[PDB]
Symmetry: C3
Subunit: 206 residues, 3 copies
């Protein structure tokens, strides 16, 4: 009869495209040095993630929720936005993140943060968009960040922030951790319109 | 400006009215000349059997259970499982008891809205909201704010059906930060399973 | 293809209430003009005449109180009075243009489990909206808050939210957020408090006429 309130539809549509990203180094036989998340943006195997997640890695590994694991190639990065692009080569079709180029994020929109915090396995948290940028000078030093109260922890960087429909809203960045009060529910994401742009460029140029 | 007088507020009150009455305050009392630990428990059925956390009731001289309707009962320990950290309590069922809604056919799905029900910091029964963040961790992971005092309490969906028994939050911190919104619960099917064994073996 | 579906959202509540929640700054002197920010909080414009509700703690010991609206207007606020008993303060601003006001439905009764949005200015990041539910509406017995009429919510509250608003999905004022419950032992998660709106309206009116 009756069904529980749920955001499972958005999960089923978007989670398959969000991947766990492992940065591995020399060690001296390789080991995990940095951990993060990433989003499969296209059928060809292009994945977005944060630049600080893959910096100075000797081997980047990408693990999908279906169980596939691939070695990924660094296609290029951008420090100004801390975005990086990876490339993987799969035989079977790759799941992609739903993108509605014409959807406009609104303050108060329900959102789900998808990533791999503390390497516990893919995790989905829920919140809303708290702000869609600032006009004046603020402590973040930026003007186009999306702010959300969906729990973000280390390991979430490079992951997806989607809406109740499963559409990409942005890429989560590092979390706001200290002041030294302990901030609660204050996270940031690079707006998706800006992530697509930076990607197309990096793919063909950078 | 406008009139919202007849509009209806979004709410999970239906789940509260149906589930919260069966979630009790569990007090671990000791000798001093007193409360040692405190947690929550879920009344599982009319027989008076209650599920809670093993760590909440360890080494107790007297275990007290308090219902939201005002009644207080002394509970006897029926059994506990080191492996899952669950424990079963027993109070006198005469006079009828509120029980937690259970839909044995309901399967929890990642993304389902959940409410954590317990007594954090002994502030009084508290309801927090989140979603099922993951399953098979056999633990359910949730971002419903959980605090000391919530252990042994309930995790229910918007219909008020039990999804699991809350245990602890994630504490591992690397650079020195505090994990946010990462809590665990034992899936209701498994908890039911353990309870049956604990009761039977008792 | 979701192109035609509608994303779940509380944007309606934000558009109705947020414009009336202001940023409150407490400025004082320091070393050697030289008026700096000493404390920061939020406030809610309750009446078109310009009366604003905030927390006493934020405006205590202030040489100058500044109030900034989300539309860009900045004013110097006048301290009308305080109520130590609830940490509520009333401010007055004199504006020519017309002021946005918080939606108040006096017949609405807050229920445990209702969705709520906290609106304020945490860490001076600029107006922020967080989401949760009402965890409790008062307590019958003696409890750690020492009071019986506090609203409790798990909507993330941070330093800066104080004096700000808590509204429901309709944008109706549920209460005025208090200082954030920051430390036990452990560090609490999702536990905040607010003064119920009906109580805040009575306190305001009395302070206006009397003191």
């Amino acid at each position: 009869d009756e069904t529980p309130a749920s955001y499972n539809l958005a999960v089923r549509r978007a989670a398959p495209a969000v991947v766990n990203v492992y940065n591995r180094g020399l060690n001296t036989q390789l080991e995990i040095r940095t951990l993060g998340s990433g989003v499969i943006m296209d059928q060809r195997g292009y994945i977005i993630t944060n630049k600080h997640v893959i910096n100075d890695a000797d081997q980047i590994i990408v693990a999908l929720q279906d169980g596939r694991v691939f070695e990924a190639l660094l296609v290029g990065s951008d420090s100004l936005t801390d975005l990086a692009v990876l490339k993987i080569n799969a035989t079977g079709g790759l799941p992609t993140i739903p993108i509605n180029a014409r959807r406009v994020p609104h303050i108060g929109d329900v959102v789900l943060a998808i990533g791999n915090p503390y390497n516990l396995g893919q995790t989905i948290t829920q919140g809303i968009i708290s702000a869609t940028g600032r006009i004046g000078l603020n402590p973040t030093g930026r003007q186009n960040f999306l702010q959300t109260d969906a729990s973000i922890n280390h390991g979430n960087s490079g992951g997806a922030l989607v809406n109740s429909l499963g559409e990409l809203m942005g890429i989560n960045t590092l979390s706001f951790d200290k002041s030294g009060e302990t901030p609660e529910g204050i996270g940031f994401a690079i707006p998706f319109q800006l992530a697509t742009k930076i990607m197309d460029k990096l793919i063909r140029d950078g």
